[PDB]
Structures are given as C-alpha cells and as structure tokens.
Enzyme design. Structure first.
Site, short mmCIF file in Angstrom:
data_model
loop_
_atom_site.label_atom_id
_atom_site.label_comp_id
_atom_site.label_asym_id
_atom_site.label_seq_id
_atom_site.Cartn_x
_atom_site.Cartn_y
_atom_site.Cartn_z
N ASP A 15 0.82 -1.25 0.00
CA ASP A 15 0.00 0.00 0.00
C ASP A 15 0.84 1.29 0.00
O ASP A 15 0.29 2.38 0.34
CB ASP A 15 -1.02 0.00 1.16
CG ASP A 15 -0.34 -0.17 2.53
OD1 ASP A 15 0.91 0.10 2.62
OD2 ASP A 15 -1.07 -0.55 3.48
N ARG A 29 1.00 6.85 0.27
CA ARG A 29 0.25 5.82 1.00
C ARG A 29 -1.18 5.75 0.45
O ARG A 29 -1.86 6.76 0.30
CB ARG A 29 0.28 6.17 2.50
CG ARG A 29 -0.53 5.26 3.43
CD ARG A 29 -0.08 3.79 3.39
NE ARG A 29 -0.69 2.98 4.46
CZ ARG A 29 -1.88 2.40 4.35
NH1 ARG A 29 -2.61 2.49 3.22
NH2 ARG A 29 -2.36 1.71 5.40
N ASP A 34 -5.57 -1.21 3.82
CA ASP A 34 -4.43 -1.66 4.60
C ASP A 34 -4.07 -3.01 4.03
O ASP A 34 -4.83 -3.98 4.16
CB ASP A 34 -4.81 -1.75 6.08
CG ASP A 34 -3.61 -2.02 6.99
OD1 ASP A 34 -2.55 -1.47 6.70
OD2 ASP A 34 -3.82 -2.60 8.05
N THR A 35 -2.85 -3.07 3.51
CA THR A 35 -2.25 -4.38 3.16
C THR A 35 -1.43 -4.90 4.33
O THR A 35 -0.94 -4.16 5.16
CB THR A 35 -1.30 -4.22 1.93
OG1 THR A 35 -0.36 -3.15 2.13
CG2 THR A 35 -2.11 -3.97 0.62
N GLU A 37 1.82 -6.13 6.29
CA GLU A 37 3.26 -5.82 6.13
C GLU A 37 3.94 -7.01 5.47
O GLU A 37 3.41 -8.13 5.48
CB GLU A 37 3.96 -5.47 7.46
CG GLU A 37 3.31 -4.33 8.26
CD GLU A 37 3.33 -2.97 7.57
OE1 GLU A 37 4.33 -2.72 6.86
OE2 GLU A 37 2.34 -2.16 7.69
N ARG A 75 3.95 11.22 3.91
CA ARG A 75 3.47 10.41 2.78
C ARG A 75 2.30 11.08 2.11
O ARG A 75 1.37 11.48 2.81
CB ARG A 75 3.06 8.97 3.18
CG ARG A 75 4.25 8.25 3.82
CD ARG A 75 3.90 6.82 4.29
NE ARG A 75 2.82 6.86 5.28
CZ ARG A 75 2.28 5.76 5.79
NH1 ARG A 75 2.79 4.58 5.44
NH2 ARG A 75 1.18 5.83 6.55
C1 LIG Z 1 -3.97 5.39 5.25
C2 LIG Z 1 -3.65 6.47 6.28
C3 LIG Z 1 -2.72 6.21 7.30
N1 LIG Z 1 -2.42 7.21 8.17
C4 LIG Z 1 -1.55 6.97 9.33
C5 LIG Z 1 -2.40 6.27 10.40
C6 LIG Z 1 -1.44 5.27 11.03
O1 LIG Z 1 -0.69 5.89 12.12
P1 LIG Z 1 0.36 4.97 12.98
O2 LIG Z 1 1.67 4.91 12.22
O3 LIG Z 1 0.48 5.81 14.22
O4 LIG Z 1 -0.26 3.64 13.26
C7 LIG Z 1 -0.49 4.95 9.87
C8 LIG Z 1 -0.88 3.65 9.17
O5 LIG Z 1 -0.09 3.49 7.98
P2 LIG Z 1 0.62 2.08 7.64
O6 LIG Z 1 -0.52 1.09 7.51
O7 LIG Z 1 1.38 2.38 6.36
O8 LIG Z 1 1.54 1.71 8.79
O9 LIG Z 1 -0.59 5.99 8.92
C9 LIG Z 1 -3.12 8.45 8.13
O10 LIG Z 1 -2.88 9.33 8.99
N2 LIG Z 1 -3.99 8.71 7.17
C10 LIG Z 1 -4.33 7.79 6.25
O11 LIG Z 1 -5.23 8.09 5.43
CA LIG Z 2 0.06 -1.56 5.89
#
Ligand SMILES: Cc1cn([C@H]2C[C@H](OP(=O)(O)O)[C@@H](COP(=O)(O)O)O2)c(=O)[nH]c1=O
Ligand SMILES: [Ca+2]
EC number: 3.1.31.1
Length: 129
Positions: A15, A29, A34-35, A37, A75
């Site tokens: 993702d 992103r 959510d994919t 890891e 991102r």
């Molecule tokens: C998809 C997305 C993730 N994020 C943040 C939330 C999550 O915070 P945390 O890092 O604190 O868990 C993280 C999840 O992304 P990943 O799934 O790439 O780890 O990215 C956003 O803020 N907005 C979004 O639209």
């Molecule tokens: Ca992910």
C-alpha cells in the site's frame, strides 16, 4: 476528484509506492486500505501485486481526495491508478487489502471499496480464505 499525472520511481510494498509527482519524489500511501506488512501473511503477495500493477502501467496517476493530502510521516495520501484502474480497489477486490483508515473528509471512494471487499470476502479470496 481529479486524476493528476505521476511517474513510478519504485515499488515499496502493498500500500506504499515511490512516485514522482509535480517533479518531486514522494512516497504515497494508498487511501482507504491496509495491506499486510511484508513480514505478515499475504504481505509478500500484496507487495507483488502492487509492484506488478505499477511497473506494468504505461500511465500512472494519483487522485487526491477532499481532505489531508499528506499524512504525519510526509506520505502523500491518494488513490492511485495504473492505466486507468485503481490500485486501491484492485487490492481490496483481490482480498490482498482490507478497507481501513476511513477518516471523514478523505473517504470519497469508501463505498466503491467496501463493495469490492464484500465480493473478495464472498469468494473467500486470500485474506478472506
Ligand atoms: C492510510 C492512512 C494512514 N495514516 C496513518 C495512520 C497510522 O498511524 P500509525 O503509524 O500511528 O499507526 C499509519 C498507518 O499506515 P501504515 O498502515 O502504512 O503503517 O498511517 C493516516 O494518517 N492517514 C491515512 O489516510
Ligand atoms: Ca500496511
């Protein structure tokens, strides 16, 4: 919403992808999904799927939603399209991502993606197997 151009710099995982957008390298992103890891079950398959979709595309586009365009990590937050097909939706439809991270204001394609997830789940595909 509006599709805008970008070019692939590098596949990262299921993702996230590195694209050049307005001439600048950015990690994107994918909105609303959510994919797993890479180190998790179906993480490799999700990475491969995205990799193939973006590397084979002739035309990459990004489409920002109505809300925040970058997350707290810098991102870009967008829907990505490869030759007009949305990667976010394709991942969900194949059972390689869950609809996730639905924040008010960046949720334009929520119902399209949930409809995809329902069908992947019916077919018991991948994550839903
Ligand atoms: C998809 C997305 C993730 N994020 C943040 C939330 C999550 O915070 P945390 O890092 O604190 O868990 C993280 C999840 O992304 P990943 O799934 O790439 O780890 O990215 C956003 O803020 N907005 C979004 O639209
Ligand atoms: Ca992910």
């Amino acid at each position: 919403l509006h599709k805008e151009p970008a070019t692939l710099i590098k596949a990262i995982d299921g993702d996230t992808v590195k694209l050049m957008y307005k001439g600048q390298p950015m990690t994107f992103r994918l909105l609303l999904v959510d994919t797993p890891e890479f180190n998790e079950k179906y993480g490799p398959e999700a990475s491969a799927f995205t990799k193939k979709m973006v590397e084979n595309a002739k035309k990459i586009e990004v489409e920002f939603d109505k809300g925040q365009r970058t997350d707290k990590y810098g991102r870009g937050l967008a829907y990505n399209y490869a030759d007009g097909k949305m990667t976010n939706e394709a991942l969900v439809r194949q059972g390689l991502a869950k609809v996730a991270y639905v924040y008010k204001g960046n949720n334009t394609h929520e119902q399209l993606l949930r409809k995809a997830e329902a069908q992947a789940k019916k077919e018991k595909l991948n994550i839903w197997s």
